Amino acid sequence: GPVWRKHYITYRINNYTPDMNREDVDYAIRKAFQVWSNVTPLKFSKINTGMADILVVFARGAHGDFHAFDGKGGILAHAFGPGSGIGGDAHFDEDEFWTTHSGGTNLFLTAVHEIGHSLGLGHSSDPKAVMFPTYKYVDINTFRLSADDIRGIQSLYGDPKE
Ligand SMILES: CC(=O)c1ccc(-c2ccc(CC[C@H](O)CC(=O)O)cc2)cc1
Ligand SMILES: [Ca+2]
Ligand SMILES: [Zn+2]
Ligand SMILES: [Zn+2]
Structure with a gap:
């Protein structure tokens, strides 16, 4: 399947949820990217101007991409x-x-x-995987990618460099 064709990838936070302060949204997103960069050669950096490779957007209902959201619950x-x-x-x-x-x-x-x-x-059938289709809470301090997630992402990008 299609894959990113470079290792240095930028992200930009388009807008922010009012549910958490800006520091907390930034930290959550930064840490999430870090989970994936920890087990591949990919590098992620936040930018505040210009066109980013990945735009993080908060939106509700119909928002211009033919995939409207559905209110509280359901698709998150x-x-x-x-x-x-x-x-x-x-x-x-x-x-x-x-x-x-x-x-x-x-x-x-x-x-x-x-x-x-x-x-x-894509999705995993392994109930311990982060790519499992259904949200469940796990202690952030005890969180780890499953072996399934690791094999999956390394099959696309390889493992860390020496
Ligand atoms: C086990 C673990 O750490 C874990 C982490 C995240 C998830 C997770 C699964 C699905 C979702 C949301 C799925 C979304 O509504 C639609 C989609 O992207 O498929 C969020 C978190 C499940 C397990
Ligand atoms: Ca929803
Ligand atoms: Zn959308
Ligand atoms: Zn999913």
Whole structure:
């Protein structure tokens, strides 16, 4: 399938959810990218001007991409695989209640799953995998990618360099 054709990839946060402060949204997103860069040769950097490779957007309902959101619950976010235009972009349903821990939908865990899609990964049947299709909370301090997630992403990008 299509894959990013460079190792240095930029992201930009288009707009912000009012559910968490700016520092907390930035940290969740940064840490989510870090989960994937830790096990591949990919490098991610945040930019604030210019066209980014990956745009992170919060939106609700119909928002211009033929994939309208559905209110609180159900689909929590979605993302586009590598390709032209919006390819790579990650959209989070603003009707969810985003949190730093577990009092609602954890942004970090959700961002890990969606960035997986943005990098080219599909769903897993392994219930311990972050790419499993269904959200579940796990202690952020105890969180680790499953072996399944690791094999999947390394099959697309290889493992870290010496
Ligand atoms: C086990 C673990 O750490 C874990 C992390 C994240 C998830 C996760 C799965 C799905 C979703 C949301 C799926 C979204 O509504 C639509 C999609 O992208 O498929 C968010 C988080 C599941 C397990
Ligand atoms: Ca929803
Ligand atoms: Zn969208
Ligand atoms: Zn998914």
